[PDB]
Design a protein around this motif. Structure first.
Motif, PDB file in Angstrom:
ATOM      1  N   UNK A 267     -11.241 -37.157  84.381  1.00  0.00           N
ATOM      2  CA  UNK A 267     -10.999 -37.848  83.128  1.00  0.00           C
ATOM      3  C   UNK A 267     -10.048 -37.074  82.286  1.00  0.00           C
ATOM      4  N   UNK A 268     -10.341 -35.800  82.133  1.00  0.00           N
ATOM      5  CA  UNK A 268      -9.633 -34.924  81.236  1.00  0.00           C
ATOM      6  C   UNK A 268      -8.201 -34.838  81.740  1.00  0.00           C
ATOM      7  N   UNK A 269      -8.016 -34.632  83.032  1.00  0.00           N
ATOM      8  CA  UNK A 269      -6.662 -34.484  83.563  1.00  0.00           C
ATOM      9  C   UNK A 269      -5.806 -35.719  83.453  1.00  0.00           C
ATOM     10  N   UNK A 270      -6.325 -36.863  83.824  1.00  0.00           N
ATOM     11  CA  UNK A 270      -5.537 -38.079  83.746  1.00  0.00           C
ATOM     12  C   UNK A 270      -5.212 -38.454  82.333  1.00  0.00           C
ATOM     13  N   UNK A 271      -6.136 -38.150  81.429  1.00  0.00           N
ATOM     14  CA  UNK A 271      -5.912 -38.408  79.997  1.00  0.00           C
ATOM     15  C   UNK A 271      -4.721 -37.644  79.465  1.00  0.00           C
ATOM     16  N   UNK A 272      -4.574 -36.384  79.842  1.00  0.00           N
ATOM     17  CA  UNK A 272      -3.405 -35.609  79.380  1.00  0.00           C
ATOM     18  C   UNK A 272      -2.153 -36.215  79.923  1.00  0.00           C
ATOM     19  N   UNK A 273      -2.208 -36.653  81.169  1.00  0.00           N
ATOM     20  CA  UNK A 273      -1.037 -37.271  81.795  1.00  0.00           C
ATOM     21  C   UNK A 273      -0.716 -38.592  81.127  1.00  0.00           C
TER      22      UNK A 273
END
Ligand SMILES: */C=C/C(=O)N1CC[C@@H](Oc2nc(Nc3ccc(N4CCC(N5CCN(C)CC5)CC4)cc3)c(C(N)=O)nc2CC)C1
Length: 300
Positions: A267-273
């Motif tokens: 979640x956290x990673x895709x959100x930054x992207x």
């Protein structure tokens, strides 16, 4: 775990109206329809599943309903109730645009990085919630995510989902037909399913999307899949995928399950992207009283 105080609602046939059909056979008929509680002065769009009696089928579907009732999230498709007609019916929130898989296919030319990345997020979010509820989906696929709106997708069709019993961290499944190309290796080898089993399936699901609905290991017989994965072969990198995205997908396909990322990390990673979509994905140029189910909350 703790007591499951999910509410299960029983609905009258007279309370809802079927409007049309949105696919039928191999299961039974799924109808577009509308449900109007008795006094409420509101109309809620729903999908109605009428079983194709065979006691086996009634059992299966009630198990499906049990699972849906036990989950409440924005990112998990909502279950309104069930109807105990002769033929049992399952009433659930209607996602007008159908499965995401068919969706990406019919719209390759219009989906942009923002849409895709956001979706990845929404599913990770949905899935992470099921991890919280100690649930193993076991059939996470692009075909099992349905589209409420192009900006909003939800997980659904818990044909094989299972709720872990207490102090139970794995599920061992008796043999049945199962999604092979989506499955983790351990699952194929040992019929064991876990959340990290679900992550791998998540990784495939993303690949499903970033290829705009391609078929994984197309052609390759399901019989030969385990060898390959054992061999260290994996799905290829979609044309539009930056190294960043694909790297993330690959970590989902590690052999060591604790090696794979947890959904929160996803979640956290895709959100930054998704903050900066175009850097992480490269694409060729970028009914008066009706209430949505999400907006409706049952009496008492
Ligand atoms: C990947 C498809 C799949 O797995 N199926 C099999 C049966 C379906 O089931 C459900 N279907 C829905 N909703 C739903 C809403 C709308 C649609 N269509 C799809 C086709 C589309 N067009 C037809 C007209 N063309 C000219 C253009 C394209 C219109 C929308 C399909 C399905 C739901 C639900 N909750 O909404 N639930 C289920 C599961 C019981 C999914």
């Amino acid at each position: 775990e703790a007591p499951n105080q999910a509410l299960l609602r029983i609905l009258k046939e007279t309370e809802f109206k079927k409007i049309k059909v949105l696919g039928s056979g191999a299961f039974g008929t799924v109808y577009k329809g509308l449900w109007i509680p008795e006094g409420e002065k509101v109309k809620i769009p729903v999908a109605i599943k009428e079983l194709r009696t065979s006691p086996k089928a009634n059992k299966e579907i009630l198990d499906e309903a049990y699972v849906m009732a036990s989950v409440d999230n924005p990112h998990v498709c909502r279950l309104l109730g069930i109807c105990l007609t002769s033929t049992v019916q399952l009433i659930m929130q209607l996602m007008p645009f159908g499965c995401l898989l068919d969706y990406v296919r019919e719209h390759k030319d219009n989906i942009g990085s923002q849409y895709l990345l956001n979706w990845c997020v929404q599913i990770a979010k949905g899935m992470n919630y099921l991890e919280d509820r100690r649930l193993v989906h076991r059939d996470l696929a692009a075909r099992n995510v349905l589209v409420k709106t192009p900006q909003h997708v939800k997980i659904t069709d818990f044909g094989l989902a299972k709720l872990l019993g207490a102090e139970e961290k794995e599920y061992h499944a008796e043999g049945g037909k199962v999604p092979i190309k989506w499955m983790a290796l351990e699952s194929i080898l040992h019929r064991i399913y876990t959340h990290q089993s679900d992550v791998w399936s998540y990784g495939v699901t993303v690949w499903e999307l970033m290829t705009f609905g391609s078929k994984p290991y197309d052609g390759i017989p399901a019989s030969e899949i385990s060898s390959i994965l054992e061999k260290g072969e994996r799905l290829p990198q979609p044309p539009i995928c930056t190294i960043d995205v694909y790297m993330i997908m690959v970590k989902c396909w590690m052999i060591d399950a604790d090696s794979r990322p947890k959904f929160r990390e996803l979640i956290i990673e895709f959100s930054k992207m998704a903050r900066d979509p175009q850097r992480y994905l490269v694409i060729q140029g970028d009914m008066d009283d009706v209430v949505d189910a999400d907006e409706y909350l049952i009496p008492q």
